[PDB]
Amino acid sequence: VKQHLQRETQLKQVQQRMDAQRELLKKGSKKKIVDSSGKISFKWKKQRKR
Amino acid sequence: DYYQQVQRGKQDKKISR
Amino acid sequence: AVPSVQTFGKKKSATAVAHVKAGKGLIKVNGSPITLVEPEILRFKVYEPLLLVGLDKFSNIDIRVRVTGGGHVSQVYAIRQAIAKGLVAYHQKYVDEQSKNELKKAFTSYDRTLLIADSRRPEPK
Amino acid sequence: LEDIQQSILKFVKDHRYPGLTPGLAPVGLSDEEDSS
Amino acid sequence: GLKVPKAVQKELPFKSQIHQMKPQKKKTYMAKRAVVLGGDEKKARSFIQKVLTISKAKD
Amino acid sequence: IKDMFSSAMEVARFEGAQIKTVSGIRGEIKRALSKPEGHYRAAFEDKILMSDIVILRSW
Amino acid sequence: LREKAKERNPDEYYHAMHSRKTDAKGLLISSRHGDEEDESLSMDQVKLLK
Amino acid sequence: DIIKSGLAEKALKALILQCEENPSLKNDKDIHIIINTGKKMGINRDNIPRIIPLTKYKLFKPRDLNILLITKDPSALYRETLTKDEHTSELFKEIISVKNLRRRFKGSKLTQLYKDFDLVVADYRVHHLLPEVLGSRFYHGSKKLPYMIRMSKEVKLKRQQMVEKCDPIYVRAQLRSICKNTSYIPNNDNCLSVRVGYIQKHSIPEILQNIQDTINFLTDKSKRPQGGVIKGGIISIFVKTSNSTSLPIYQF
Amino acid sequence: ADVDLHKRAGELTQEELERIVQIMQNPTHYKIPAWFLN
RNA sequence: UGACGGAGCCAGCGAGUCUAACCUUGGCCGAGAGGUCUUGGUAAUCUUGUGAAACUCCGUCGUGCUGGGGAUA
Numbered sequence: 097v098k099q100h101l102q103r104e105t106q107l108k109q110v111q112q113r114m115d116a117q118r119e120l121l122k123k124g125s126k127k128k129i130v131d132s133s134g135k136i137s138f139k140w141k142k143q144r145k146r
Numbered sequence: 147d148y149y150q151q152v153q154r155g156k157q158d159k160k161i162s163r
Numbered sequence: 164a165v166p167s168v169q170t171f172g173k174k175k176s177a178t179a180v181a182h183v184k185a186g187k188g189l190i191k192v193n194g195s196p197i198t199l200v201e202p203e204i205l206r207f208k209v210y211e212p213l214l215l216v217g218l219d220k221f222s223n224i225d226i227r228v229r230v231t232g233g234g235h236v237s238q239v240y241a242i243r244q245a246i247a248k249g250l251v252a253y254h255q256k257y258v259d260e261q262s263k264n265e266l267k268k269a270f271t272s273y274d275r276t277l278l279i280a281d282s283r284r285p286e287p288k
Numbered sequence: 289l290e291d292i293q294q295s296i297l298k299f300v301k302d303h304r305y306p307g308l309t310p311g312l313a314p315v316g317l318s319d320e321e322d323s324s
Numbered sequence: 325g326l327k328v329p330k331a332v333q334k335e336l337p338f339k340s341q342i343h344q345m346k347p348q349k350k351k352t353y354m355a356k357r358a359v360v361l362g363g364d365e366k367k368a369r370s371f372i373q374k375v376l377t378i379s380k381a382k383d
Numbered sequence: 384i385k386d387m388f389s390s391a392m393e394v395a396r397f398e399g400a401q402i403k404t405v406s407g408i409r410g411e412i413k414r415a416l417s418k419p420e421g422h423y424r425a426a427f428e429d430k431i432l433m434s435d436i437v438i439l440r441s442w
Numbered sequence: 443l444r445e446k447a448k449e450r451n452p453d454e455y456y457h458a459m460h461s462r463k464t465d466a467k468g469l470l471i472s473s474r475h476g477d478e479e480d481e482s483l484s485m486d487q488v489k490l491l492k
Numbered sequence: 493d494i495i496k497s498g499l500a501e502k503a504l505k506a507l508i509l510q511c512e513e514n515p516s517l518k519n520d521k522d523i524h525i526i527i528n529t530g531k532k533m534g535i536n537r538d539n540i541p542r543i544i545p546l547t548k549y550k551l552f553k554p555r556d557l558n559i560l561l562i563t564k565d566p567s568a569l570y571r572e573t574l575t576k577d578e579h580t581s582e583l584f585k586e587i588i589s590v591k592n593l594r595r596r597f598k599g600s601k602l603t604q605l606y607k608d609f610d611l612v613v614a615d616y617r618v619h620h621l622l623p624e625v626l627g628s629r630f631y632h633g634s635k636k637l638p639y640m641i642r643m644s645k646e647v648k649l650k651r652q653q654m655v656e657k658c659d660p661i662y663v664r665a666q667l668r669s670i671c672k673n674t675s676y677i678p679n680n681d682n683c684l685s686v687r688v689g690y691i692q693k694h695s696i697p698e699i700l701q702n703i704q705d706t707i708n709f710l711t712d713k714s715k716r717p718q719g720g721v722i723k724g725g726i727i728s729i730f731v732k733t734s735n736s737t738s739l740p741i742y743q744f
Numbered sequence: 745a746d747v748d749l750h751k752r753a754g755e756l757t758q759e760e761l762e763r764i765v766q767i768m769q770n771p772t773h774y775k776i777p778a779w780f781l782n
Numbered sequence: 783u784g785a786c787g788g789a790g791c792c793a794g795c796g797a798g799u800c801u802a803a804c805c806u807u808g809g810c811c812g813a814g815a816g817g818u819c820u821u822g823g824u825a826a827u828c829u830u831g832u833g834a835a836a837c838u839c840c841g842u843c844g845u846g847c848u849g850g851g852g853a854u855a
Binding site for chain 2 (some may be wrong): 502503506507509510736737738739740
């Protein structure tokens with residue numbers, strides 16, 4: 097059960113990164129936001145979808 | 147003298163074999 | 164997609180390929196800038212294609228040179244030949260022919276070995 | 289089982305050089321300070 | 325194998341040029357994407373390979 | 384060739400002789416080398432290997 | 443091969459020297475993928491695969 | 493267990509009395525123990541000398557012997573911070589890098605280098621690419637075989653780089669450990685040599701004590717990467733100078 | 745010996761010169777490393 | 783035009799399953815042949831590709847030759 101839990105949390109993280117990449121390549125204006133560490137995020141322009 | 151004892155020992159061991 | 168131009172400069176076994184295209188004005192030899200070309204006493208041999216015609220010709224174009232082979236002085240002669248005839252070919256193809264042959268006249272009045280090497284030798288007397 | 293239930297319900301090492309871990313010297317407290 | 329020199333093979337005709345493709349150093353996306361199946365499928369792959377090499381060596 | 388002779392005088396005595404490897408590669412001894420004493424320079428039909436033995440058939 | 447290099451005849455045009463190209467050292471680039479595929483795939487293809 | 497009896501003391505005494513007078517070994521000044529293990533110790537011979545810690549006898553101080561130090565590519569950091577520290581500023585006879593070492597020393601220069609130094613110490617990141625640079629004279633046998641040192645007390649994690657610094661107190665501490673202790677190299681067969689003691693820097697009870705120290709550290713069960721390699725019954729001990737016969741001890 | 749390594753050897757006080765010659769006379773007990781001297 | 787000590791850099795030749803030392807010290811196994819380990823000395827234009835040296839830069843010195851038994855620590 098513990099290794100089922102480890103497999104599930106690793107799959108959740110890799111699907112989360114995959115979903116962020118897919119969300120990133122759709123469309124709209126965005127900028128690369130960099131934090132203190134280097135964990136980058138993408139902040140999207142306040143503009144609703146036509 | 148123990149030096150010459152042990153080197154004669156390995157010598158005659160090889161000679162006996 | 165960009166207007167670009169490729170030329171070649173040769174001395175003994177050095178050879179330098181210069182790509183000239185439109186840009187902001189950066190002149191780069193082997194990735195490093197032109198102001199790093201050693202042996203540092205022939206840096207003005209490299210510079211004279213720029214100083215003979217003015218930097219206002221180079222203010223709108225960016226050159227890059229890749230130099231292989233040869234030695235130190237053969238490489239600076241390949242660099243200056245490649246830069247000179249690349250500027251001439253760019254002003255031929257994408258700027259006017261009057262500036263083209265003004266550049267050819269200036270380089271040929273300084274030395275035509277900026278534009279034409281001395282290539283096949285000896286003489287069998 | 290208590291640690292496994294808490295999880296389910298909540299010496300040098302160079303990576304490139306595996307010979308370092310038998311390689312390097314066992315330094316002591318008597319080696320770092322005094323007159324040589 | 326026959327190791328033809330680079331000075332010769334850069335100066336070859338267009339018909340005689342030697343198609344030598346470089347190895348890949350980058351973990352490309354299609355290779356990191358593509359799925360392989362396991363268990364019964366990998367032993368099926370092993371079986372088909374053994375059968376095909378026994379057939380080729382017998383021939 | 385290393386050790387079939389003990390001296391450059393011996394190789395000088397035997398210059399020009401035809402030798403061969405055990406592969407049947409024919410050869411000829413040419414000149415004694417200077418500093419290693421019984422070592423000499425031979426020329427063969429083609430490139431012999433490091434796993435060979437040369438042979439001077441005498442009577 | 444050395445004799446063919448001596449007798450190249452540099453006025454040698456083929457139609458395949460539009461598609462085929464040459465690296466920096468002068469040798470032949472052989473694309474290791476396909477030649478019935480494409481190495482770079484489009485944005486909507488990447489959207490579907492991702 | 494305990495190895496100090498009249499057989500061992502008589503053998504070691506007779507070896508010293510032989511090497512004082514014999515005109516065939518008046519240059520080699522050293523005592524080695526040959527351990528004949530029972531089984532074949534399985535680990536193959538890399539040329540990395542593991543360190544056997546003696547407990548109460550420093551057999552060498554780091555200032556009474558020539559030390560060559562081999563460093564990484566740029567070498568300016570290690571050379572400056574080692575030579576103007578005054579904890580280590582006089583400890584190394586030479587500090588070079590691998591690039592200019594193999595540039596300078598080719599051929600018989602390596603024989604002069606061998607005869608010049610007596611402790612070769614390399615950065616552990618360059619220790620593996622030494623057997624071509626230093627040739628086979630340093631790796632046939634083991635008396636100038638180079639030691640690994642860590643120069644920085646810093647560990648490499650994945651996805652990130654070792655910050656390039658060096659620590660002179662740490663490197664003096666591990667050269668002190670290296671000269672203070674003795675060393676061995678594991679191999680496949682059942683023969684294993686360990687240097688113990690010198691010919692006039694030492695005496696019979698201290699040489700016998702560090703012989704027993706190497707025995708304990710070698711056939712120990714713990715300390716298993718560095719020292720616990722004798723898995724079976726250690727069968728025989730011998731003592732010899734490099735051109736002297738194997739005087740036997742502890743025939744089990 | 746604490747003498748400055750840029751002074752010319754003429755201007756040497758006798759305690760500095762005797763410190764120099766004492767160190768060079770008995771190098772071992774001043775723990776000079778044995779590779780400096782042959 | 784030097785001597786030490788660091789640093790920057792620039793070639794063209796050359797690709798046969800082929801390329802390459804010697805003498806020892808000992809331990810163990812084996813009937814022997816030998817195998818394997820261990821060890822010190824000597825020799826060296828290294829080994830297949832990366833790389834040359836002269837050159838360039840930066841600190842330091844400072845320009846009146848060579849010998850063995852004798853004799854001072």
